[PDB]
Amino acid sequence: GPVPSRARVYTDVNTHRPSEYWDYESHVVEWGNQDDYQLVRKLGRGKYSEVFEAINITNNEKVVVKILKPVAAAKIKREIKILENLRGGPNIITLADIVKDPVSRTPALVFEHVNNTDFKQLYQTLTDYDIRFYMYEILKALDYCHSMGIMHRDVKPHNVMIDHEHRKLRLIDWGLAEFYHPGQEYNVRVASRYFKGPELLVDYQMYDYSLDMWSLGCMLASMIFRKEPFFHGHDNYDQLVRIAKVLGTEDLYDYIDKYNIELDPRFNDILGRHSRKRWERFVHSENQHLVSPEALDFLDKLLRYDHQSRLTAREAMEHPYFYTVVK
Numbered sequence: 001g002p003v004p005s006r007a008r009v010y011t012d013v014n015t016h017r018p019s020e021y022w023d024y025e026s027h028v029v030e031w032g033n034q035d036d037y038q039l040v041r042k043l044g045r046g047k048y049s050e051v052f053e054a055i056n057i058t059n060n061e062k063v064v065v066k067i068l069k070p071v072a073a074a075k076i077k078r079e080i081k082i083l084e085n086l087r088g089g090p091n092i093i094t095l096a097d098i099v100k101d102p103v104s105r106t107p108a109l110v111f112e113h114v115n116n117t118d119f120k121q122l123y124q125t126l127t128d129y130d131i132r133f134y135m136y137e138i139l140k141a142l143d144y145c146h147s148m149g150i151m152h153r154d155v156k157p158h159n160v161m162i163d164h165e166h167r168k169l170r171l172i173d174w175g176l177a178e179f180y181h182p183g184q185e186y187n188v189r190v191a192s193r194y195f196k197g198p199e200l201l202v203d204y205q206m207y208d209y210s211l212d213m214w215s216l217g218c219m220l221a222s223m224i225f226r227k228e229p230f231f232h233g234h235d236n237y238d239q240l241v242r243i244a245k246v247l248g249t250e251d252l253y254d255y256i257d258k259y260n261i262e263l264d265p266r267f268n269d270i271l272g273r274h275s276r277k278r279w280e281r282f283v284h285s286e287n288q289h290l291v292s293p294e295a296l297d298f299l300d301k302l303l304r305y306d307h308q309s310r311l312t313a314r315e316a317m318e319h320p321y322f323y324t325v326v327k
């Protein structure tokens, strides 16, 4: 059987919490008044939800309304509990209300308003300084939820809202989030395929907060190397092959040997052998302005097969990549 694994930080935070903190199934949903909101314009969507800019008529304030489709609606208690637990934390989206549409029986989550800057245009414009600044903002959100015994499990650009005018960031869409309990075996079918950590791709269920740190490295790699997504797999097996063509197979087999992981028996024909690529092969004239030895050293410390060997969110914040960021 596989060798067990525990987080190297915030391991015991949920054991010292009363059961009401993490036992989301026992939480009672206090439903607000849906007549308190007027839908103004669509901001965007997801496979799980329809997102709108709205007005809260009880205080004439702009709000964000997330209408949950049945897939997202199934896990509402867990999403609500996690949002309530993290409310007020650094760069965490603020849940303002929970409502239901009498006509369709569909629920919706109401959030604080975020004046979001263009998604497909933020990726193209952020300077070297901006990337460092915003990465540090994400790390504040990640260290916070991890410290509160929660794994986001869906870190990607679509789940990060940026108000570039006010240089404000929010870590959003906590629908896939989970409470970390040491020794617990989690479902690996979490997050987008592109941002999945190798622990998920190899069916290593006993994962932890470090999964978010892999996803954060995928984001950074994509940004500095101007390749979106950075690991573009066709399916879950191929996703690991894409990772292996950059990180090499040798470190991958050391990882599976360390935890005694069993791969599919056709593993040698699917994965084969691949050498570790040097980060310099991804550095060209058009992206060299985003690359520094500190960016590469930081990246290398996030994109590690061994989930126990990646920087934690707090250690990532001490990295020299962030020295030039005004604090």
Ligand SMILES: CCc1ccccc1-c1ccc(C[NH2+]CCc2nc3ccccc3[nH]2)cc1Cl
Binding pocket: 043, 044, 045, 051, 116, 118, 119, 122, 123, 124, 126, 131, 134, 135, 157, 158, 159, 160, 161, 162, 219, 220, 222, 223
């Ligand atoms: C390559 C990603 C990245 C790497 C390093 C630093 C920042 C970012 C980033 C982070 C976030 C965004 C903006 N993403 C917007 C996501 C979004 N907008 C929405 C609007 C409505 C509903 C959901 C929504 N999700 C853009 C970017 Cl470029």
Ligand SMILES: CCc1ccccc1-c1ccc(C[NH2+]CCc2nc3ccccc3[nH]2)cc1Cl
Binding pocket: 201, 202, 203, 236, 237, 238, 240, 241, 262, 263, 264, 265, 266, 267, 270, 271
């Ligand atoms: C049943 C335990 C077992 C005993 C002996 C040999 C293999 C397995 C096994 C163990 C796990 C799985 C499913 N997980 C496969 C993970 C995986 N992802 C890959 C991506 C690329 C290449 C191989 C890959 N294998 C399938 C299997 Cl068959």
